[PDB]
Structures are given as C-alpha cells and as structure tokens.
A paper describes a structure:
Ty3/Gypsy is a member of the Metaviridae family of LTR-retrotransposons characterised by a highly defined targeting pattern in S. cerevisiae, integrating in a narrow location 2–3 bp upstream of RNA Pol III-transcribed genes. The minimal factors required for Ty3 targeting at Pol III genes are the TFIIIB subunits, Brf1 and TBP, whereas TFIIIC is essential for directionality of integration, which occurs in a narrow window of 2–3 base pairs (bp) upstream the transcriptional start site (TSS). The Ty3 intasome is a pseudo-symmetrical tetrameric complex, in which the four integrase subunits are engaged with two Ty3 long-terminal repeats (LTR). Two “inner subunits” harbour the two active sites, placing in close juxtaposition the reactive LTR ends with the target DNA and are each associated with an outer subunit.
Analysis of the structure reveals that a phosphodiester bond. has been formed between the 3’-end of the LTR reactive strands and a cleaved 5’-end on the target DNA, confirming the activity of the assembled complex and suggesting that the majority of the particles imaged by cryo-EM correspond to a strand-transfer complex. Interaction of TFIIIB with the Ty3 intasome is mainly mediated by the C-terminal region of an outer Ty3 integrase subunit, which stablishes a novel set of contacts with the convex surface of TBP stirrups and Brf1 cyclin repeats. The SH3 fold (residues 369–433) of the CTD of an outer Ty3 subunit establishes direct protein–protein interactions with the H2’ helix of TBP C-terminal lobe, positioning the Ty3 intasome upstream the TSS. Topologically, this TBP-Ty3 interface overlaps with the binding interface of TBP and the RNA Pol II-specific transcription regulator negative cofactor 2 (NC2)49. The binding of TFIIIB far upstream (−15 to −32 bp) the TSS constrains the positioning of Ty3 intasome active site also upstream of the TSS, ensuring that RNA Pol III-transcribed genes are not disrupted by the integration event. The structural data unveils how a newly discovered chromodomain in Ty3 integrase mediates histone-independent interactions with Brf1 and the downstream part of the target DNA, acting as a “ruler” that safeguards the integration upstream of the transcription start site and prevents gene disruption.
Numbering used by the authors:
A (entry chain B): 151 to 384, 389 to 437, 440 to 504
B (entry chain A): 17 to 197, 201 to 437
C (entry chain D): 17 to 139, 148 to 200, 203 to 327, 331 to 363
The structure:
DNA sequence: GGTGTTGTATTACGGGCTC
DNA sequence: GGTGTTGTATTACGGGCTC
DNA sequence: TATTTGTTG
DNA sequence: GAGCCCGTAATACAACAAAATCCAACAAATA
C-alpha cells in the first residue's frame, strides 16, 4: 500500500479475540498502528462495550486526540462495516478502505504488530486471570521504545524525536536528546521523515523481492467470468464448496475484482484475487432460452444452484451446456413440477 | 544510580589497557586468554581504545569489563531499563550503539539460550527441529499398512458416517472402509477388508482411541502385528493414508459435488479410480505395483508386449520379483528425493540421554484445549530414553498424560546456566 | 565540466538501465549480484526509470554510478564545497532528495565509520538540561461534576509545562487508589517526567509511585507539596475549570464524556495568544483537523450524524469564546 | 481509490594475517 | 521397535536447425 | 416491535 | 556463444494435516 504520509495520515487497525476475561473484557485488542512512525497503540476494550455506536468512537477519539488521521485500512468486521461508521468517517474526511472478505493481509502491519504484541503479552501474562490490565500500557511503552528492523530507529523516537526518560544516548550525536526549543523542530523532524521514508522504500523493495519470486499476477478485463472458490456459502467437506462463475463489474486493482456473486443481497461484493480463479468456457452446447414457454420445459436440464433471491421470489441456478454465468430466472411456476429433492441437497 | 562508577584492574581488557599504561598487571585465574588477545593485538595494528579519566572505551562505544557482562545484558534484555526480552537483533540494536563487547553476537545468542523466559515463550519456527528420516521403505507386498480416517462427513442415510482408508506402504492400494464414526467391531470390518489380502507385519497409524485400543493392541501382539502409533498431534507418520485421503477428498468432491448424502455408492469408484491411476513416486499404477492386472485395459501401454498376466500361471514369481526390485529402487529414489527437497533447512537434534527438554504446549495439553494468548510456561521436563531418532520419551509430571511420546517438532531443548 | 559528463558502462546501475536498452553487459569480477538485481528488477514492480539521452533517473532523483561514490561522498561531506562535516541526518537530508543512491544510508554511515578527521572527543554519557519536553508535568483536582449516569464526577487535568500541552479526562472524585496510576500509565504516551509538581493539597500517594519507579528504571519522584509560586501559571490553572464548565453547560446525558477528546483537540488546536503556536504543530507536523465537510445530511446513506457535527461546531464556538474571554481578561487585567 | 509485513536465528561479506 | 508424503502446475535439460 | 436470518473478524 | 522448437522429464510447493458449533453484531423479511 502507499508508502507514508505526514505522521500517520495513513493508519491501520484490526481486531483479534480469544483473550481471557478479567472484567468481562474478552476483546481487549483494538490495536491502532501509526503506519508512518509505527507507533502502534493498542487500548483495552471488550465486545460488549460498543458496536461503533456509543463508546467505541470515544476512545477512538482519545486515541485520535493526538492527531486525526486521513486514511484508515481495516477489515470487513461488523464493527466497521456499519452505516454509522462509514458516514461519520466520510464526514471526518477519512477513508475506510476495508478488506476483501477474509483477506487480513490488507491490515498486515497491524496484524504484524499483533504478532509482536502476542509474544510480549505472553511474556507479561503470568497473572493471566487475576490482575493484568496494567500490562497493556507497559507493553505499549516497551514495544514503542524498542528499535525495529526495517527502519533502524525505535518507533517512539521516529515521531516524537527524542527517546523516553533515562537517556541512553547512542554514539551518533546529542540529537536524540532534542528536548529543547521548538522553533527548529520542523527542519530536523522533516529530515527524520526523509530518513524514515527512505527506509520504507527499502522495506517495500525488500517485501517485493522475496515474495514475488513464485507469485504470478492474474489479469482479467471487465466481462470475463471468474470463480470465487470460497467465501460464498458459510459440513463443507464433501459438498461442492466451490461455486459457479460470476461476471466481474469493477476492477479496483490488478488484484481486486468486484463481481456479482449473487443478485443484490449483502456484504461487499469485491473478492481478492487469492480466492479468485480464471474461468474458461471453450467448447454439443445448447442455446439461451428467452421465451416464456422455454423456461418450463427446459427446467430438467439443471446442473447446480446458487440460492433464492432475498428481495422477491426468484431462484437462480445453473443449467447444462448453456452460458454458465448468464443464468435464467426460474420462479415457482416452473419450480415445483421438476423434482427439487436433489436441489436443496447441495444448498444445505 | 548509574553504572561504570567502579575501577576494575583484574579482567580480560587489562592487557589491552596496559598498552598505554604499562603499570600494573594483576591477572587472575584463566586469564591466559588475555595474554593471547594481547599477543594478537601486538602482531596486528587495530589500536583504537581510548583511555579518558577511568572511562576506557572503543572508538565510540563503551567496552564493559567481563565481571558485569550479565548485568548489562540483563539490563538491556529485561525490563529493568526497558528491554523486553527480544531477539539478538534488537539486543544488538540496544547494546552495540553504546557498547563494543568483542564477540557480542555470540555472547547475546548465548544469553538468549540462557534466559529462561525466552526459551519458554519464543517459538522460532518449532516445526523444523529434526531431519526427515522417513519410514523404512518396504518388504514383500502387503506387509506394511497405513491406518487413519477423517472423523466426520456430512452424514448419509443413518447407516454410514465417515471413511476409513487402508493403503499399503509398498503398493499404495486404495480401500473403501466406510465406518460409522467405531465400536470394538473395528476389528471385524478391518479384518474383512485387509484379510481379503492377508495379515500385515506393522501398522503405521496414529494414537487414536480406536487403535490405541488396549483390546485391539493385544490382538496385534498375539497375532504378530507391530504398531508404530504416531504420537499426539503428529499425523505426518501416517503419510500414505493421509496423502490418499488428500487424493480421496478431491475424488470424493469430484464424484459427489451434486450427489451429497449418498457418497457410499461412489466410494468403490473412488478407490478403483485411485487404484487405476499411476502415481509419481512409483510411476506405475498400484495394480501394476501389485500383480499387474489392470482389468479395464482401454488400450495397451507403452512397450507393447503380451501384457496378459492371466496367461502366466507358474512364472509369476519372476515377474513379481522384477516388479519388487524396480519398485524398491523407486521407493529408495522417492526417499532420497524427499530427503533432498525437505532437509535444506531441517536442523537435526540428537540428544538420546540425560537432558531437560520441554514441550511447548502442543501434545502436552489437550488438542481440544484452546490455544490463546495465555502464557506458555511449560515446566522443564526430563528425558530418560531415546525411543527413536526423531523423538524422545519424557517423564510427564501429571497423572499419566495417557502417552509420553513427543516428536521433535515440539521439544525445543531447555538449557540451564550456573 | 561538472559531474555526470562521463561514460561509465561498467557498474551496478548498468543492469538496472539495460531493462530497455539490452545492448551491452560489460560486468566485472564477482558481478553476479548485479545480474541477480536485474532479475529482481524483472520480477518485481519498481520500474519507473526514465530513459532520455543518457539521463537515466528515478521518479525525481538522478542516479549516480558506483565508481564515483568516493567523489560524491567527498563533495557532499567535506569542505570542498562549503561543507562542515555534519551528522548523518543533515547529510542525508542534503543528499537523498537530489540523488537516488541504492543503499545510501548505509553508504553514509560506512563513510562515517571509515573517516578519521571528525572522530575527536565529543562528550557526557547523558544530556543535562533543566528545560526539556514532557520531562516535567503537573496535575490538579476538581470537584463539581455530574455523575454522568456512570459515577464519573471528576475531571483529571494534566499540564505539560515544557510544551504547554494539556490532558483533561473524566474520572471519579471518590477515587481518582491503584486505578489512578493505571490510567496515568495509559496516559503516559510520552514517557516519564523528572519531577511531578502537582502542588494541590496533601498527597498520601507517591509511595506506590515510588515503588513503581523502583520496579521500573526511571527516578520520577512526585514532590513540591504546599509550594507557592503564583506567577502566570495560577491564571491558567484557574481558567482550566472554565472550559470544563462550558462543556458541562452543553448537556448531562451523553455529556462531555462524549466528545471530550474533541474538546481537547479543538482546545489545543489554537495558538496561545499568538505568542506561542498550537501544541500539535509545535511538536508534530500539524495533526490536521479536516473539518471541511459538515453539511451532507440529505441522505446520510439527532444522535448519529447530525447532532455529532453540530456538537463539534458548538465546541469550536465554545473554545473560540473561551479564547476571546481569556485574551480580553489579559487585556483588562494587565 | 482498497489490499502484506517485521522479529529472528542464521549466514554472507569486508579489514587484518599468514601466505 | 515409533515417527512424513505424493498431486500439481511449473520449469529445466537433450535431439535437430540455423548458425 | 420482537424474533428471525444472510454475512464477517 | 545465441536462440529456437519439441519432447520428455525432473522439481520445489503446498495439501492431508478432527469436524463443526456459534460470539457479537451489522443489516433485510415478514406480520
């Protein structure tokens, strides 16, 4: 994703669960990572405090009290796909840029912070159940002061300039003890911004080196069919977990295709290319029924099923030796005559 | 309350610091390393030590006397001055900008192997801890048999629930054991489906309760059947059956995509298709690895011959001997190819006696016990026997733990320090 | 007559520049790293070099051949062109915006390691200064607040005297005792101070704070009890309660505990009587406000969207009124 | 607009010696 | 005694042509 | 207006 | 060196790694 901005105008956040309760607090991981400086704040919370209505925004603002962002990158969680969250962020001038239906790699740096956080959480988690909510600010203060690898400087001193108390000033200069007159902070803080920016082009290059060696890009134009292979129907072992092809609508990125998996139902019809797969229909195939009487007689030539439309009474399914994505609508007037005993078996 | 407010005339760096002073040389026991280091310094030209008002240091970093080495690395590794128990890289980034310490990297990795919480908390890819070291290849046909099954499928009409597989280690011959997720009558169905061919020598399987099975094990001890019994949550040893159910899962999806809830009809077709299709590690169909009588014969294969083993009546001994020889060398080729493409990073661990190894909360606690952000503080266990090259039995300090065999993918040997 | 007016077809950048040329590959010994780098350029996405009349350059930076690396570092480090032997920060701020230089920071630090003229006695272990930044904080206590239907009848004021930053936050007046330092520690985003100069009343605390400092590495002692300076700061501490009273005057249900961080944001998002700038951009870049879009309530795709931004605008008007009243108070009093 | 990313043992490459 | 193992796109190496 | 039911960290 | 066709044929890379329940919580659908 885009490299950096002016001190966390780009930001990321994500949730992980499974944490043991202490005051009915079994979420406690709202980690917000200041992507430029990687300050990586995380504040204790719970599932039942809010669902982006009353109190979630309030500690979101007490985090944001130290500077409003300009870009969010988050997941498809229900706590951020709500209409209340998206509209308030739009009125705040801050984008959403959600994920792609179980593709957490969009939130990679927050999740990598969690991976660093989890080890330190186990280190500080001796009193697992009794009293340990004091350890998250301790883990924050330890993790921020520790130097990272991709930048060579601790994330605490990247943004704030100086290091925390008990100075252990290195052999570079006295410049890391910058706690003095503030009219000249802009020049050297911008110099450090240049340093960190250079370290992030180095980081982006390093990421693209060792990962693209085996990976092969997928190039699809709008109109061609595509399979989704997962995240379409949530006993998925022997049954056809992989579903039929859909028509792509919007090509957001080279690895981001928006497609019509169902008619108009729900939940953010864009799928990352990892689930997506090319479809090829090179092939005695039959023709396309368009008449009113051809939808009744040609109803025993079905192959698979998608489901039932939620808006009205119209079933979508696949026929045999026809255009796969271009389905033919079959209502109840031509549904009960054909044997439907073998139809709901693949839906259940 | 800062450090370095102390003079130390008795340490390793005394010989280095007397290159300017030349006054007092009060060396200690085992300080002959200082003499060798001073000799190496004398025969070279790397003099960069600065002597300024009791602060003896490197070009820009403070050299520390060896008396307070552990104090400094604990200070910059524990939370006394906000370390955090990180790896060698972050420890260097905390220490090497301020201190020099000849062979600092080796000292820091020694401290990482010394600090106990880093041993119990960190993982550092605990899936590459032993070599591959695969199973011994084979014997005559149908003597080694691999056993496992997937627990649950979408149920049929209420007579069949899950699929069990038997494939032999030599020929990889598919089988259709359709069970009900079973009772002590496992030996009935299992007997009816292997005894079609005959009794094996060893069973390569998991520690499953239908096979740990004290009633069933005594049957094997009486009959003359061994039992490898792969350890808790280590299904790699089952192998051929696991790879078959990998191939079976694709086949079962292919034959039951639109035909769920009646896949027991298609299961013999699944096994017959697996049987008729040649594999890669042997290059021949499992019929041809056995008595080669592919009955379908859609067309004759390459190097056209009689290809009718029904006509041969007494001469089958030489044919089976030839097939056995070529398939044995093909199994050895598969073994060495697997070992080459896997052991490029697999570091071995060979202890075999008298250590204090750990088990990092996998096969120690329950597989059904939830893994979470709860601390990983398994105690220092002990090892008393070398049960295999790739595992060590432990004295599990519990009631029984019902098993004490731990494959090397969970050990991460504990190291103490005086 | 200046640099870059010379042909150098045998260096590391040749493999990068032959992605479109593909003419000649006159490499040196042990130059298989350059072929690996060209393979890397082939299999990745960083191709943005512009190829025009021998000027091969990155999106805004002219690449330099590796042969004259010594010439470039001597030109931009020594006193050949009015230098001065600055640090790595100033040197990289001078060099990097103009030239691309793969592995530039390591080149600069390696030149610093292999130079001899600058390495003198520089002095010592730690900095000594009585004036700093986040190294001295003070706090006070307030009493009269609504229960907020959650017994949150207190406001915790924190002062950042070295930078005039503030932290106002709701607490309970019954027990501001271990829970006080818990929320203080989650407040501590900017490190421990040297001394805490609260000076409000008798304090039976700073014993468990002392035990915390013993358990930690900092010598932050809490002191200055029953002192009396009363020079300017007393006016600020007295006027601190005024903004909280204005926030009280808004409402009581879903009150100032909702959007009180926004009250702090546009409370310190204003210059202190034009003598000192805002605390956000006195330290950070700006901490942008971005209030530009506020009237789009036609569809929205009195407690969700509309009243929230009305309350934001009301808080902005309230802090403008408070700024006007404090500047007119200073005008009348002085 | 929207799509990985660092911590970590492990290992590879220059000054200085023997040539 | 007891502890991985093949299916699969993907890619690397010889006969025959131009040299 | 309560009880449902699609999908997703 | 330099590349190309074509025909085999090796080659790391990942899947079998127990299965399936909801938890909390957005928004559609009736009646």
């Amino acid at each position: 994703l885009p490299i950096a901005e002016g001190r966390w105008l780009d930001i990321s956040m994500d949730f992980v669960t499974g944490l043991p309760p202490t005051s009915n607090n079994l979420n406690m991981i709202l980690v917000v990572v200041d992507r430029f400086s990687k300050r990586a704040h995380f504040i204790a919370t719970r599932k039942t405090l809010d669902a982006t209505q009353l109190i979630d925004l309030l500690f979101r603002y007490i985090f944001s009290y130290h500077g409003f962002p300009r870009t969010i990158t988050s997941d498809r969680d229900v706590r951020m796909t709500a209409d209340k969250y998206q509209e308030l962020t739009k009125r705040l001038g801050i984008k959403s840029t959600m994920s792609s239906a179980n593709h957490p790699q969009t939130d990679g740096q927050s999740e990598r912070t969690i991976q660093t956080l989890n080890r330190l959480l186990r280190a500080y988690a001796s009193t697992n159940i009794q009293n340990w909510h004091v350890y998250l600010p301790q883990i924050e203060f330890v993790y921020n002061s520790t130097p990272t690898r991709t930048l060579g400087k601790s994330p605490f001193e990247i943004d704030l300039g100086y290091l925390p108390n008990t100075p252990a000033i290195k052999s570079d200069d006295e410049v890391n003890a910058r706690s003095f007159t503030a009219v000249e902070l802009a020049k050297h803080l911008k110099a450090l911004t240049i340093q960190t920016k250079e370290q992030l082009e180095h980081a982006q290059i390093e990421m693209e080196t060792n990962n693209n060696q085996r990976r092969k890009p997928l190039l699809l134009n709008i109109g061609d069919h595509v399979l989704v292979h997962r995240d379409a129907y949530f006993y998925m072992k022997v049954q056809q977990i992989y579903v039929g092809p859909f028509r792509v609508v919007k090509k957001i990125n080279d690895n981001a295709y928006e497609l019509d998996l169902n008619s108009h139902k729900k939940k953010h019809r864009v799928i990352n290319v990892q689930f997506l797969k090319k479809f090829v229909y090179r092939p005695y195939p039959k023709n396309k029924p368009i008449s009113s009487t051809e939808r009744i007689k040609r109803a025993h030539e079905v192959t698979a099923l998608i489901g039932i439309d939620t808006t009205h009474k119209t079933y979508l399914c696949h026929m045999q030796d026809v255009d796969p994505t271009l389905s033919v609508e079959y209502s109840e007037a031509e549904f009960c005559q054909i044997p439907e005993r073998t139809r709901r078996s693949i839906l259940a | 309350s800062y450090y370095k407010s102390d003079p130390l005339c008795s340490a390793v760096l005394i010989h280095m610091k007397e290159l300017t002073q030349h006054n007092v040389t009060p060396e200690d026991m085992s300080a002959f390393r200082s003499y060798q280091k001073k000799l190496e310094l004398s025969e070279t030209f790397r003099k960069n030590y600065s002597l300024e008002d009791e602060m003896i240091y490197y070009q820009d970093r403070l050299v520390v006397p060896i008396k307070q080495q552990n104090a400094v690395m604990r200070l910059y590794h524990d939370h006394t001055l906000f370390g955090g128990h990180f790896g060698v890289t972050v420890t260097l980034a905390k220490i090497s900008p301020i201190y020099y310490w000849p062979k600092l990297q080796h000292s820091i990795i020694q401290y990482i192997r010394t600090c106990v919480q880093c041993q119990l908390i960190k993982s550092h890819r605990p899936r590459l801890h032993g070599l591959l070291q695969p199973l011994p290849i084979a014997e005559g046909r149908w003597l080694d048999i691999s056993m496992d099954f997937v627990t649950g499928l979408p149920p049929t009409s209420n007579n069949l629930n899950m699929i069990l597989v038997v494939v032999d280690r030599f020929s990889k011959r598919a089988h259709f054991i359709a069970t009900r997720k079973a009772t002590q009558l496992i030996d009935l169905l299992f007997r009816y489906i292997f005894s079609y061919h005959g009794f094996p020598r060893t069973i390569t399987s998991d520690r499953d309760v239908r096979m740990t099975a004290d009633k069933y094990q005594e049957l094997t001890k009486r009959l003359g059947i061994k039992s490898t019994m792969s350890s808790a949550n280590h299904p790699q040893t089952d192998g051929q059956s696991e790879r078959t159910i990998q191939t079976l899962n694709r086949l079962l999806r292919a034959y039951a995509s639109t035909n769920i809830q009646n896949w027991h009809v298609y299961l013999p077709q699944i096994e017959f298709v697996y049987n008729s299709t040649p594999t890669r590690t042997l290059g021949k169909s499992p019929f041809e690895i056995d008595l080669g009588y592919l009955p379908n014969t859609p067309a004759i294969k390459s190097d056209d011959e009689v290809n009718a083993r029904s006509f041969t009546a007494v001469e089958l001994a030489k044919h089976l001997k030839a097939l056995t020889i070529q398939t044995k060398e093909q199994l050895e080729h598969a073994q060495i190819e697997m070992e080459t493409n896997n052991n490029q990073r697999r570091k071995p661990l060979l202890l075999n006696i008298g250590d204090h190894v750990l088990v990092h909360r996998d096969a120690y606690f329950k597989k059904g016990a939830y893994m979470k952000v709860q601390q990983i503080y398994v105690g220092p266990f002990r090892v008393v026997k070398k049960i295999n090259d790739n595992a060590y039995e432990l004295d599990l300090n519990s009631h029984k733990k019902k098993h004490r065999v731990i494959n090397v993918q969970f050990l991460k040997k504990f190291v103490y320090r005086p």
